[PDB]
């Protein structure tokens, strides 16, 4: 992929805004990359609830390296557009502009995409409870005496 | 709580703890005999292991 | 994260609203800044009631120390965009301003991923009533004679 | 907290309101206080009602002391948000003004908050009705010739 | 088709949007046709979910070869409308434009159209779970004591 590190998003996200593209002869300003990466840390590690959320192998950016611009985002190609549209969501607001009906509706198809295989994943179904029996049938379990499910 | 005391007094600052065996020696055990039991249960039949075992 | 203080979420808060960031070329006085900072403390104290609302983490500047500002939050990764999402909007009458519709929506969705894990963990079923019999299948009850719940 | 004054609330709430404040260059004028806290002093009555109302701590100031600014609320660290966001919809009609929507929401929202727990303190249920019997799996309650409910 | 890169297939895409053409005075710099395959690059890898989502053909590029436009995209004939339609719906926020209604019926109806086949071929029937009997006139499976269906 051509969009590999945390500014990659940002210009990405940026350029969709119309604030900083070559279509529009601009460029980005410094301040302007280190707030978008600020927001950007932020809302991956919302998304992110240490496990409970959304996974996206997002790494985030540990204290002690100093510049985040300029790091892998580790994410996988299918994880991009979603990301770098809903970072143009929310970094429209800090010039008083509103992301377009497109880049919303990119935006929420995006982080539907990226949830879908985590939620096959977590649709398991519980165990037999603790006081079903395994019938007859399983004439195995009920000649090694196990009778009942164990549960949990 | 006190009527479960089986000490005169309780541990205090610098008090020197004694050593009882100073020597190596072959012990001999005596015991009021309900102070020792054994408890044992079938390996349970539902394990990962003993999975195909009859 | 880089915001790691109080004084950097309003910072952040005053950013998203656009009011003041390091890119601008008018800022606003430490007193507005203290206010602000006081602002935020209200808001967690309402959120956090007494141990009971919402539990962040989050950690209350004590008079003893003077500056408020410059404590650290105690937030984790994951509070700290539904937190100063929630203070930029707390904050944005004090400048004749109101917060945009997805500074709100973030704002809102961010509150409940904070409060999603608390309420799992509050989702708890009670015991069985005191005149309920446990049975005569449960074998440890029947050896105790244990032949009602305790309940409670 | 900081805000530990009727004053501070006073100023709290035409911050809010956006008559006094640093974000706009104005100052607090001496007659707005007092009728301010005047307000405060008839809305801290009208919701504690004698008692049985919204329960806060609230200090109800009497005719001794001369400057009624001043003195400590008494509030918890919780009331406050709640406390001055209503203090400043109320007072916002003096300067032929309208609180926005977020200080009519939060005001809501505080005000609700503030009831919550004691109105979880007050559901409480009756006891059995004086014509009732205890039963006769009661053991003691029959023996001791409690054979119907005291009530009341 | 006259459209066998990606390249080509973004041209269209402006041509449809009317930002560039051949017949045009004025024409895109190369820099805004890399953005352009950028986010073709990453829609295409969005929606082909690493082989579980819309399956076109669709060459991804490799970083190795340095220009991603020149690559021949691999699409049937019938996909490069679909693609290309999308594409310019994608990428008409850079240039503070709106896809025209036709344009976003088009992609519509191309995403739709391109699922088509597959979704044809994933709609299929689980086997026969393990509890189902065989029957017994089944003949060779009574008598080579197959009487359970396998399942899974």
Redesign the interface.
């Known amino acids: 992929?051509?969009?590999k590190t945390k500014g990659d998003l940002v210009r990405?996200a940026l350029?969709?805004?119309?604030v900083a593209?070559?279509?529009t002869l601009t460029d980005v300003?410094p301040?302007?990359m280190?707030?978008a990466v600020?927001d950007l840390?932020?809302?991956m590690?919302?998304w992110?609830?240490?496990g409970?959320?959304i996974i996206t192998g997002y790494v985030?950016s540990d204290d002690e390296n100093p510049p985040?611009e300029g790091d892998d985002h580790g994410l996988?190609?299918?994880?991009?557009?979603?990301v770098?549209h809903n970072l143009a969501?929310?970094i429209?607001?800090?010039?008083?502009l509103?992301?377009?009906?497109?880049?919303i509706a990119?935006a929420k198809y995006?982080k539907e995409?990226l949830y879908?295989?985590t939620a096959i994943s977590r649709a398991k179904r519980a165990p037999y409870p603790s006081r079903m029996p395994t019938g007859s049938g399983n004439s195995?379990?009920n000649?090694?005496?196990?009778h009942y499910?164990?549960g949990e | 709580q006190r009527a479960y005391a089986n000490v005169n007094t309780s541990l205090a600052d610098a008090m020197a703890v004694n050593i009882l065996n100073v020597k190596d020696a072959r012990t001999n055990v005596f015991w009021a005999d309900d102070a020792i039991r054994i408890v044992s249960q079938?390996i349970?039949?539902?394990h990962e292991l003993?999975a195909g075992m009859?």
Chains 1, 3, 4, 5 share one sequence.
């Open positions: 992929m051509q969009i990405a350029r969709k805004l119309g593209s070559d279509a300003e301040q302007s280190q707030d600020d840390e932020a809302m590690a919302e992110y609830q240490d409970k959320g985030f985040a996988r190609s299918s994880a991009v557009s979603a770098f969501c929310r429209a607001p800090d010039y008083a509103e992301a377009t009906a497109k880049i990119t995006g995409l879908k295989q195995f379990a000649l090694n005496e196990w499910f164990p | 079938p349970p039949a539902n003993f009859k």
